[model samples]
Target chain A: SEAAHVLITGAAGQIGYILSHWIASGELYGDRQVYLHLLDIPPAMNRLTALTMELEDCAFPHLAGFVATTDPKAAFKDIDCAFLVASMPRKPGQVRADLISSNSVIFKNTGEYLSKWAKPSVKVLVIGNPDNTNCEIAMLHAKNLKPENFSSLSMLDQNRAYYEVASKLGVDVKDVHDIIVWGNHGESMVADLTQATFTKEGKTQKVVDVLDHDYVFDTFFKKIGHRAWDILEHRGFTSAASPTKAAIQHMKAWLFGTAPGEVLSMGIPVPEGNPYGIKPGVVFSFPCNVDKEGKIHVVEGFKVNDWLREKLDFTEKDLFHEKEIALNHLAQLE
Target chain B: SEAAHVLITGAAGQIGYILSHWIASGELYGDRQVYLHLLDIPPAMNRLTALTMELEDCAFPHLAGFVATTDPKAAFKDIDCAFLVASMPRKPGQVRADLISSNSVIFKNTGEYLSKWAKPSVKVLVIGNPDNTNCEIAMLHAKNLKPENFSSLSMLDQNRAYYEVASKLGVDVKDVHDIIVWGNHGESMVADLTQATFTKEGKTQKVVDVLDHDYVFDTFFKKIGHRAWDILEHRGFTSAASPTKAAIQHMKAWLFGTAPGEVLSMGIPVPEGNPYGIKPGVVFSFPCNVDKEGKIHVVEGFKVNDWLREKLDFTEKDLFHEKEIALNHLAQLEHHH
Candidate 1:
């Protein structure tokens, strides 16, 4: 099979280093080969070079080639897959609005360059936070490009939600399913387990049967939300490995088809006529199944009770507000 | 559609960290999942824990589970595939025999544990050097275990030898084939490019056509032997990533069948019957191919020149003497070697 060429923006960042290895060693891409482009700030070129040497030493058969550079034109050119992992980390007491505003500028420029130089078949997944909003800003700037090519990686939040459910159910991760994390990629992120199933003794049970609604509402959502800080507390730094892993997962599932009947959270560009009742101005995280065309459909028709509906509405509103703010900020800039 | 359970010993090492993320991230295994068990020394526990946390954050579908431990018994228990990566680095002034002797003890202990507790279907590949001889000691202790299930990784040396040949010929890596690396996994290793082909612009050329025999002999045989030391001189540490990659590649090729007509190096157990002019003795390195049963067959009918023959003889002697000394030493203590 032909190789999938993966272009990683902010490739020298923590997530990029971990993700590069994931693709090269044939872990992420299966038997499909990989040619990587590591793009970063002008200052990080030396570090990228050293990392590239280490990558060659690892000798992943899937790694067909590698190119590290500061030029966006060179980096974004001919890339089949793009992971927007680069970002400015939020500081203590930083405002969410300010974080989005700051990242929009970086993404806006990246979007412009990608629109002009990106490969015709490129699929992009953003990881930098205010990730979902940042993705919207990139999408707005690259208006002429295909909307389906852009997405925010919410697989991290979905993964955390799955882990919490697994812990509560006292089953291995494989037993947990239908964990769909939706809405914003932040605290307002919805870790919905309304459809979750837990497998035990070769029998699969619903999340409601194994755990109470109160536990699902409070413990599950809050636990996964704060897992980053939990790891940060132990390791003294933010995690790049997991997100790097998530970004890879998002790309692989989007490029290749997902397993039968399994749906995941991806911040896809919502179509205007979609029946999910989402206002179509931006990309938002939703439970979706992606195929060769990417993000084939938004999962709908699930019954949401008053409590969950209210939470989903709150999340949807927050996402709209963030996209509005980013769009307004972009409009005001020029 | 079940995940492949891969247990990596010395998980906190440089190579382990690289391999873990690669496998977990869907790069290597793709949709085929991995349940990773990262076993390291007690001190490296903190590092592996952090890595595991990161893995959870990434949420790899293939990453079924992770375990970091210092205890080999707990670590090796139920492992489907085992990569023996733990090793003590050779000192600046250490002799080869002393180095082999020291690693022999480590291999011996690990082998006993594997034979006792490792899953019956477990495939073990040793990367710690002197790898070929260390595998011999391990096989001797693992008498009850399947011999074909164990082998030493020599693919890295073989990879380097092939790369050097390809570079001289100015051909792509995939273009070169049938390059055989033999004997000890060290400076005295034999790299035969007799069958390697170099194709350019529809013109097929044997590797021998583009490069002089003397140059090929020196670079493939002598230069590759010192390649590790060359990196160490510059980086101030032993080369682990390349060989570790080779070790992983060896297992992947064996556990999952290789592409047709592809062959790599392994330190397979030499039967008592003389093959390739090798005497009845412990395990030795040879060019072999793996099939579904996990059995490795030594490629036969290759003509061996006197120069290559002499080096293999030397390596065989060195291995035999080391095995004799270790077995004798063990026998004197009323302990089985």
Candidate 2:
């Protein structure tokens, strides 16, 4: 069987460590072989080396091979899927503009190497902070790769939305479907529960009917958006396991295709003229469907109320500002 | 479907966090329902509360329910399986004796609770530091629970040994079998490569044939024993994910029987008049086989050279000394109560 080449930047980070184990578990790739390419800065080389050793220690039969390196050329070489997880994190007292500027440079450099060395069809999911704009920067820099191949991660927010609604309605998350997280991966992101539904007593029920409107807008939506901060407050670190799990789910759904009529959430590039009225050339979260060929198509025809539209518009503006900041940073590098 | 009640102590720690996700993945429990019970110190209550919320956020289909608490009674109540992972860690400037003394008190108290509250047949795997001695302390204190129901974890060391040898020979770890980690999970642990074999082209070959003795003993053995420290130095913290994987494998193997004629490593309590010459009342690592009934039997009759005997003797003495220390702590606690 041919192996799938998967690359993970920030390979020494907590999410990378957790994600590596899941990849090696053979649950995601099944019997198909997997070759893991790990990337980090030179200072993190030692930790990456240890992580590689740990992967070797697992000795999973399906794990064909792995390599850890600081060089982007080596890391991105022939990768089928690249999780761009490495970026300068927002430090204490650091301004948002500075964080965006620092991460933009990383994505710009990563984009150049990815366009030169990575497989043309390599699917890239940007997981670093300022992810939506960072993804847009990378996509713009990678002239050779199609914009459809790039995405930022909003699946964690999607999962959070599903959990919130499901818990409130006293139903399993599996029973809840079509919960879309729109616009951004941040606090402004809208959890579109208008079209979401859950199955109960052999019947499907809409979330709007199950949950109060004021509560959904004011409480549940806020909870989904602030979930990361909530976890950080308690655990004293950004969540590694849950986000890793969400990333796996996103990739798995993309690789294997989602269930029929299922509208999952992903941050795909808004084209020159998007139907949803989102700004073009920015990676924005929307309801998306992934086919077996690993192509992402934005889900259309779901009507939103004026209130929900306003919320989504707010995030779209935030994404547009971030995109402007990222472009400015990219221009400065030039 | 009926749910399997599983309890995890130290539920806010790194291993506990990773292990919780694994449990919630439904790979360990299969289609059966799982209800998780989490316990930690009172100070960690807030963290445990947040962890429970996080578990809820995952919204796993097979997860029937879960509870987070600081009280042993609430955590251990009727649990089918308990992973005893919470213990006092050795602090800076603290001696090994001090570490052992502190952990013994915890295990002794935990054992009393398990005996009084947990199900009579509840299977327990001690994963805390000084685990073998901790298991012995817990078992001695719990007169109601059978020693067979309790074991300490040596599976991580076994995995380290397998990986080291397999990587050296360029063989898949699954192809390498019967690699026993004997005696302790500490530096005194022995990776017995004499009986270990790897298969190729429908035939089996001994590891001794694949590598020179000097390299295997002086390099590979030392690497296996010092694996945790090596990872700590590189990663800036003790390994959590790998050890969690090993613990899950240990439980899975116990729940589901090992392959035919396969002998794995586990830290079982040394029985009275044991043939292996290990001290009685000490939990020691040995080659073990688990049946479908979840019964563990020590695998016997592997010949060892004089050098191997001497190494085993050193570990046995360590276990004996640890047992003495644990017993003294338990006695003092008895007076306190």
Candidate 3:
């Protein structure tokens, strides 16, 4: 009879603003009552209060309880699902390393509080930028939850990959399957469509067979990175709904299991014993599947050719730099 | 299969901003492919373009077609459902008569264009404020569709009224049913909870049974009218989600039929033979239901006592005044032109 306690940090931000409505209106969980807790900075109390009131005005029957506060302790307490969305955005003049250091520090403090206050069973999905590095730090400090329970969003990149392949093939988006978006959330990430399949005539066919080499390596690889920029250029605003929808579906797959033969991309903490031969402790995006019991099992044994290996190395280079920079910040915090 | 072409006017406004996502994401239509058309004034085309981009970025599979434009003719063309949400709002110190006349002119042009271009089967729901009179004027000018096809929203108020009674009873909001909101969309409207039922133990009982008498007539009646103000004062912004949620559910009930024995409050064009002795032409809120073939039918045979009669009379007065003022504006448009 108890409602699931859901936490959405950076609740006043663009993605969080829309994510609140989708979850508060019971869009994600499907008829289960949810107790929502929204966390933003102290300066946003009035806007937080206003968001809370708008949520109240929605009058969704399943939205049983709400708490909007600036305090992370209050917000994180006994949460079932923590959507850690708060991060300092990279301004125009801000260097990439500065963006990585600043946002990683927020997650360090956030992870400590989540470990101290949130339920041991709490599952987390980090969405703030530099999401891969942010998840690593949060997963490092948040020892209370299992290492596998923590994830950063690669689902948005995964969806973008799906859109590119499906749109090019003139097939339904749902027809594309097992396209792993590996490495990082940034430019270095690999949208590996090598092992992906598209269904035709009641049978599965390899996408790489029909797809062009130049399109895959030259065009498709680079184009996926520019989607948010294209949206920004046209709209004069950052993308919100795409990421929010990605977050929604991401949670749906992770917290529950995916459909049969369906594989997804999630950025998770790597173990010492790993399939991809990547260094441990840092989070990396990998192909994944959830079991019937809601446990995440990283999908195994995919062919990574020389080009794929080089692609992985570039992302690893970028990711390790950001992770070590965050580690430096974490060490200096003493 | 052809998708339903849906148009949302005032498409760049706050309600439309959120409403676009809800509908575009297939929250309302449920797996039916939709072609969305957004219309705003020329000045709003930029914001409208931005909103369209945001909707596109959502990657909703069912949103098969989209058009965002300033021209109403393109927006209204071949549309199946028209959510006429654009209206001139009442500012502080703006008198009621002026607000009515100004907004009525927009809907006059809108209704005429909709009549000219839209499919004969178009179902219209006006969401802009002064909704009742606005609906009446639109219904007057739109000669193509049935008068019953034109509606303004009382669903938000109906939900508000539902919140009051159900919250007081401490029952589930779904348990409270059939509380008709009568009269105008403004202060003079009647929240008729007299015949409303509250279901307990699988049996429907009168809401007026355990509900307080003074609470019903004095507090409950007047309290609902000020709900928007309370939301506004606290949030420092007008209510969007509540009204948008209302519009979603209201369309679900209107275009598709409601649950068995369910009744809703919709402000449609008043018929020549309404059971409640309302004047023929002016739009008023009534308890209604939809059929298998998607036709609106007013649910009748309710007992309106003397007190109810007096309450209805006041709303009728305000409604008639607003209608005549718009009629005056409509007549003067030819002269002024």
For all the models shown, what interface RMSD does each have? 3.4, 1.9, 2.9
Say which docking band candidate 3 falls in: acceptable
The window of 10 residues in a row where model 3 chain A has the poorest summed lDDT is A50-59
Residue A43 C-alpha lDDT in model 2: 90
Model 3 chain B scores worst on lDDT over the 10 consecutive residues at B52-61
lDDT of 1 by residue, B1-337 (tens): 7777777887876678667866675544557778887888777777778777776665555777777788877787877778777776788898876677677778888888888888888788887777777777777787568777688888887777766766567665667778887777666567777766777777887786778878876645677677766666544455555665677678877776666777877887775553588875666778787786666778776767787788789888877887876666555555632
Q: Write the per-residue lDDT of candidate 2 for residues B211-323, one digit (tens) a residue.
A: 89798778787777677778888888888877788888888778777778878789998877566777676889989888888888788788787877898899999988888
Q: Label model 1 with its docking quality class.
A: acceptable
TM-score leaderboard ranking: 2, 3, 1
Candidate 2 Cα errors over 4 Å, as ranges: A91-98, A199-204, A260-262, A271-280, A312-314, B91-98, B199-203, B260-262, B271-280, B305-314, B332-337
TM-score of chain A of 3: 0.95
Model 1 lDDT, residue A45, Cα: 72
